[PDB]
Amino acid sequence: VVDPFSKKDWYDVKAPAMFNIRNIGKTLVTRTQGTKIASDGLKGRVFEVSLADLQNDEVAFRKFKLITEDVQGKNCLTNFHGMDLTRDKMCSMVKKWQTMIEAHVDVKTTDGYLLRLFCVGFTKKRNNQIRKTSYAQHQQVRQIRKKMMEIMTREVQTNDLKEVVNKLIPDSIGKDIEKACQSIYPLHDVFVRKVKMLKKPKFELGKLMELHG
Amino acid sequence: PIKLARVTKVLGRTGSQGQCTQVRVEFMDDTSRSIIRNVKGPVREGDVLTLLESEREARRL
Amino acid sequence: LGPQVAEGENVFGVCHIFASFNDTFVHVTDLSGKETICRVTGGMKVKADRDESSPYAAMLAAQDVAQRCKELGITALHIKLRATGGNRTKTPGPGAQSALRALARSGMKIGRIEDVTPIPSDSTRRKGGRRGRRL
Amino acid sequence: RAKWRKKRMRRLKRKRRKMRQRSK
Amino acid sequence: TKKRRNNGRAKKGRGHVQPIRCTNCARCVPKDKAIKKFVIRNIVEAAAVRDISEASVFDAYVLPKLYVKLHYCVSCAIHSKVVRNRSREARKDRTPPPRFR
Amino acid sequence: PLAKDLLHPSPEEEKRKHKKKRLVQSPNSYFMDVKCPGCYKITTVFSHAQTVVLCVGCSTVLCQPTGGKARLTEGCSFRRKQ
RNA sequence: GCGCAAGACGGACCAGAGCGAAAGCAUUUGCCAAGAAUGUUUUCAUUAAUCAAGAACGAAAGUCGGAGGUUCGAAGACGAUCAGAUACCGUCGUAGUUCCGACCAUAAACGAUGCCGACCGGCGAUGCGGCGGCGUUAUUCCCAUGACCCGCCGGGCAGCUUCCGGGAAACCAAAGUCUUUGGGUUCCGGGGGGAGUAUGGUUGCAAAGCUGAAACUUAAAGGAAUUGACGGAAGGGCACCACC
RNA sequence: GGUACUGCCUGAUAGGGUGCUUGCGAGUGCCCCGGGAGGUCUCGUAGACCAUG
Ligand SMILES: [Zn+2]
Structure with missing residues (x-):
């Protein structure tokens, strides 16, 4: 009958100043008929983007959830939302002869943003090791867990969203945790496997404007 | 595109009734490309086969 | 009829490929995923209940949807592959691999391949019964 | 089969428990 | 006559094990008994590799791999021929098959 | 095996x-004899010593x-006695 | 695709690994009390082994009250298959599955192997504590401590191996130390059916549980292993009276 | 003084990760500069998985 695809319009999703490459892409939104504002229906999107696409030198398995908030007239302003590992990597890590270790913290940053940060680590096989399995006793595991918690808590609690994501991109936090826990047990692969968002501060234009440029 | 094929080795005979012959294919274009291929009727080593679809691969009957 | 972009740059859509043992979906959307560009299903193309899943259904479906989207200005496709998930099969249906191959034939550019099957931490009970489904 | 004639025995026994009541 | 010394299951020194749901069946089987087969393969299979490799926007993009843990009740395995019966003495050998050439 | 001196084992x-x-x-x-470096005092301590033993004047903790x-x-x- | 809610369940990691008297027991964090092994030149000085009566716990289902109802789901209702299916397959779906509070005391509750103790061949592995030992690592030197690495000791779960010896044999380092028959003790079987039925007693709200016959009937019923023949089992193999 | 080598990342020419050369397995090479020529590096190669009688 009537082509719905002629009432559609093209917009440009561009990332924040945090990463290198700016334009993540195009988004398709039906035009305003006045009953429904197209700026509003476009306001709530999550964008799943690979880290390799935003910054040229990094690994593929880090994905970022990015939220549009304000529309600039065919420019979409995106703020950080979430982060996660590609399923493939996640599975690639897990194996049958090693202890896995997990922990999480709920931290308010200095600008008020509320984040759930997840941490995954592994008992590493030693280099000359004859014994088939690497296993950490429960107390050791609890120790390591406690230290992860401590570390990332200290990392986020001191700083605002900016520096946090900046630490998330290379993942300074992971190598931090690996390094520090070497006394308890030689951890292997250690990441922030997921980042969640619980409470955003009341929306302010200026903050986001600063964040973009 | 139509291409040409060279026979490197005869492997086995695929078929229910054991009809087809599974034969390994070099390319006559001097390329080192190697593709397994099914051929009907008698084949001995050294023959050239005419391929209408040249990117296809061999499956087990 | 779509985005205005130079010859060098490719417009990215995202392709959800859903392969069960029943039938396959090849469904292309925006990057947000909140707008559907086009959806073709394995059982819409061929008429029979037996053929719904089979690699051919996915062939047809994929060729068609990739055509319709090659119309609207999307050259490149990010692919999120799916198996039915939940309590049931984590293994992807037969149609998926054939469908992907199919719309790769169509001249479309391929983005990053991701595998999303919803995966329980721990599930509610499976649909069968203690002794299983016997046949 | 054992399980089933055990069951049948309990049926029969319940029935006998009905046909002879302490009122009789 | 006792068939296996281990009774088909890995259970030793513990009373009861958590039951799991069959991949194929849905038939309930204890985790110890359950035939487990791990599967590491590629998302796209043999020919469509060389096919899609050309359609990429990326250079040297390595195909993701699918990882699936499988559980089969004793029946289903012998059906799918994932496992087949062997001779009385040869049964005793728990050394896994030589897929390593 | 089949010949052993159960009487004369090797030490x-x-x-x-x-x-x-x-x-x-x-x-x-x-019983071992412990000496803290900073003081003259000698103290007799059991090899496997529960509790915690102290040098009196210095409040020195000898051992955990x-x-x-x-x-x-x-x-x-420390020196083993005899 | 975005959010919201509810109730269940803790995947992968997870193993012939651990813990418990046995049922059984895997998200984080704290609180509460236990417990084995180990270490000990501590203390008591025979207090100990096994157990009729009698007591504590006891999967699932089941039953009463309460809360709760996502999934699955007996009953039921359809749709199919079928000669017939009130069945296997499929859609719907009650009780129940879940939590709290009272009952029930039964499982192929199985290592189908009572408990305490002594002796009797090796060999690698593992878990936990201890002891000792070059050398690596937590960056460069000193001690701690942790991770590997090489041994020794005591408990554990197991494994492999063997003309120790058993055994009807399968198999078993216990099922060994048995006509060369006696370390202590509890429970318990006496051809197969009839029957774990009848009856009485007893426990329970109920379903049932525990105790438990006889009349009669019958030459076998049974256990291991051995050749066969068969299998709608898995493998190979041949034939133009099989096909291509 | 004699005499070796030397991919990238971290934290030493040590330690710890991780690579490219031909799909794989070997070899070989991969710090910096200058200059010089010689170029489809060599040897092997299964890599095969979508009822009634
Ligand atoms: Zn099954």
């Missing part, structure tokens, strides 16, 4: 055998107890 083996299974029951622990043996604090010399 090494007897060091190896569990303390109660020896030809005669021999305690595996000894552990599962197997008490472990002396660093730099403190």
